[PDB]
């Protein structure tokens, strides 16, 4: 009869109760600013959906970041704009300062606050035990905020976390894959970067929720505490699941796919094999041992679960003994 349905265990009906104006991004009307207020300085990067530039707001002389949307992006731009406006002011959420029409591309350009020329992947393999804990807690603030607001990020990775290490300031960026959670809705599984893709995405389970971001955060943590970039290093999306299975075991994988009445892609029969769950202590060595504690291991264990429903939520994660040492 097909897959068994699933719902988020928290913030289930936040959008259902809200006026349509909140989540119906298609019907959102954009208030355009002055493109001439911003002077492009240097290109930072280019992807499939945008080109990001460092800029100067010539009115106040402040450094800003301009994200010029590619035309590929059509009316998915609307979703990002709405999400960024809904989440503005939220803890560690990138602040959207303006929306201008780019003269060259003839597409919207999103103007953000400038954090630093530094991402989390530039720093994260170099942090102390205390800093891992500190920055993980800052990330959780952003995640609980967007989840509480009916939004799932769907692209949590070190590259999407902008840090000003000197000022101990953090921002969750690139809401281009973000979506409104609607209970019972089937979503596109082609979201997030390969190494941070949850087992739900890899086994083609479309009724996923906020807990997807929690798996992605677990991938980040594992990578930080064990000094392994990335932690689950798949050659592609199939080998990605095999890499996970080599650590968590194939038995809990079969229990997961059984519970949700999911049919695994036949391609997995030849490559998945049989694996016992590995104890987290197996990944400990003299080079990462100062970052590993029984608290770190128990916390990681409660994020990296196949069953998306059995993962800690962002709020439960903030309550964890792992964060008791972080000054609050
Ligand atoms: N697609 C995107 O929005 C994007 C922008 C900059 C990158 O460096 C990578 C990706
Ligand atoms: N601080 C930065 O370099 C930065 C990068 C990308 C953003 O979308 C926002 C800010």
Resolution in A: 2.1
DSSP state of 93: B
DSSP three-state, residue 71: coil
Q: Note whether 163 and 138 are within 8 A (CB).
A: no
Torsion of CA 236, 210, 19, 100, to 10 degrees: -50
155 given a catalytic annotation: yes
DSSP three-state, residue 262: coil
Task: Kindly give the distance from the C-alpha atom of residue 214 to the centroid of ligand 1, in angstroms, as a whole number.
Answer: 22
Ligand number, closest to the Cα atom of 160: 2
The secondary structure of 137-173 as a DSSP string is HHHHHHHHHHHHTTEE-S--SGGGEEEEGGGTEEEE-
Give me 274's structure tokens. Answer: 């049989």
Task: Kindly give the distance from the C-alpha atom of residue 169 to the centroid of ligand 1, in angstroms, as a whole number.
Answer: 22
Bridge partners (DSSP) listed for residue 96:
112
Give the separation between CA 203 and CA 194, rounded to whole angstroms.
13
Question: Strand ranges (DSSP E) for the chain?
Answer: 38-46, 50-57, 62-69, 96-101, 108-113, 151-152, 161-164, 169-172, 179-180
Task: Kindly give the distance from the C-alpha atom of residue 44 to the centroid of ligand 1, in angstroms, as a whole number.
Answer: 9
DSSP state of 317: H
Question: Does 45 show up as a binding residue in the annotation?
Answer: yes
Give the separation between CA 254 and CA 306, rounded to whole angstroms.
10
Q: Give Cα 34 to chain centroid, integer Å.
A: 31
Q: Whose CA is nearest to atom 2 of ligand 1?
A: 47
Q: Note whether 172 and 115 are within 8 A (CB).
A: no
Question: Does 208 show up as a binding residue in the annotation?
Answer: no
Question: Does 278 show up as a binding residue in the annotation?
Answer: no
Q: Give Cα 220 to chain centroid, integer Å.
A: 10
Question: Strands 169-172, 179-180: parallel, antiparallel or unpaired by DSSP?
Answer: unpaired
Task: Kindly give the distance from the C-alpha atom of residue 85 to the centroid of ligand 1, in angstroms, as a whole number.
Answer: 20
Give the separation between CA 106 and CA 234, rounded to whole angstroms.
38
| H/E run at residue 80 | helix 77-87
Nearest to 302 by CA among 292, 312, 294, 293: 312
Other CB atoms within a 10 A radius of the CB of residue 181 amount to: 25
The ranges of the chain annotated as CATH 1.10.510.10 are: 6-23+115-328
* Residue ranges lining ligand 2, Cβ < 6 Å: 52, 65, 67, 94, 112, 114-117, 162, 173-174
Ligand number, closest to the Cα atom of 164: 2
6-23+115-328, CATH topology level: Transferase(Phosphotransferase); domain 1 (1.10.510)
Strand order in the sheet with 38-46: 38-46, 50-57, 62-69, 108-113, 96-101
Give the separation between CA 125 and CA 228, rounded to whole angstroms.
8
DSSP state of 290: G
24-114, CATH topology level: Phosphorylase Kinase; domain 1 (3.30.200)
Question: Does 52 show up as a binding residue in the annotation?
Answer: yes
List of residues 6+ apart from 159 with CB closer than 8 A:
119, 120, 121, 193
DSSP three-state, residue 119: strand
Per this entry, what is the length of the chain? Answer: 328
Nearest to 290 by CA among 131, 134, 135, 164: 131
DSSP state of 86: H
Q: Note whether 60 and 70 are within 8 A (CB).
A: no
Q: Write the burial class of residue 148 (CB in 10 Å: 0-12 exposed, 13-18 middle, 19+ buried).
A: middle
Q: Write the burial class of residue 270 (CB in 10 Å: 0-12 exposed, 13-18 middle, 19+ buried).
A: exposed
Task: Point out the ligand 2 atom lying closest to the alpha carbon of residue 173.
Answer: 8
List of residues 6+ apart from 269 with CB closer than 8 A:
none
Instruction: Provide long-range contacts, Cβ within 8 A and 24+ apart, for 231-236.
Output: 231/195, 232/195, 233/195, 234/194, 234/195, 236/194
Instruction: Provide long-range contacts, Cβ within 8 A and 24+ apart, for 47-54.
Output: 48/72, 49/73, 49/176, 50/176, 54/114, 54/117
Bridge partners (DSSP) listed for residue 179:
152
Of 102, 144, 155, 174, catalytic: 155
The ranges of the chain annotated as CATH 3.30.200.20 are: 24-114
């Amino acid at each position: 009869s097909g897959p068994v349905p699933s719902r988020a265990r928290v913030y289930t009906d936040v959008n259902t109760h809200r006026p349509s104006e909140y989540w119906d991004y298609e019907s959102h009307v954009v208030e355009w600013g002055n493109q001439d207020d911003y002077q492009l300085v240097r290109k930072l990067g280019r992807g499939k959906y945008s080109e990001v530039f460092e800029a100067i707001n010539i009115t106040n002389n402040e450094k800003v970041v301009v994200k010029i949307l590619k035309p590929v992006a059509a009316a998915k731009i609307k979703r990002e704009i709405k999400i960024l406006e809904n989440l503005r002011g939220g803890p560690n959420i990138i602040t959207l300062a303006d929306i201008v029409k780019d003269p060259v591309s003839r597409t919207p350009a999103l103007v953000f606050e400038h954090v630093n020329n530094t991402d989390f992947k530039q720093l994260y393999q170099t942090l102390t035990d205390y800093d891992i804990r500190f920055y993980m807690y800052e990330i959780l603030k952003a995640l609980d905020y967007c989840h509480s607001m009916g939004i799932m990020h769907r692209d949590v990775k070190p590259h999407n976390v902008m840090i000003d290490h000197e000022h101990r300031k953090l921002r969750l960026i690139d809401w281009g894959l973000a979506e409104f959670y609607h209970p019972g809705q089937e979503y596109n599984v082609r979201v997030a970067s390969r190494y941070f893709k949850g087992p739900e995405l890899l086994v083609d389970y479309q009724m996923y929720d906020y807990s997807l971001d929690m798996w992605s955060l677990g991938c980040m943590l594992a990578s930080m505490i064990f000094r392994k970039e990335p932690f689950f290093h798949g050659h592609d999306n199939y080998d990605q699941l095999v890499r996970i299975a080599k650590v968590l075991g194939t038995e809990d994988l079969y229990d997961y796919i059984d519970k949700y009445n999911i049919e695994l892609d036949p391609r997995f029969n030849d490559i998945l094999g049989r694996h016992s769950r590995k104890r987290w202590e197996r990944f400990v060595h003299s080079e990462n041992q100062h970052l590993v504690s029984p608290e770190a291991l128990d916390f990681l264990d409660k994020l990296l679960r196949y069953d998306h429903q059995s993962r800690l939520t962002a709020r439960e994660a903030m309550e964890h003994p792992y964060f008791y040492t972080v000054v609050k």
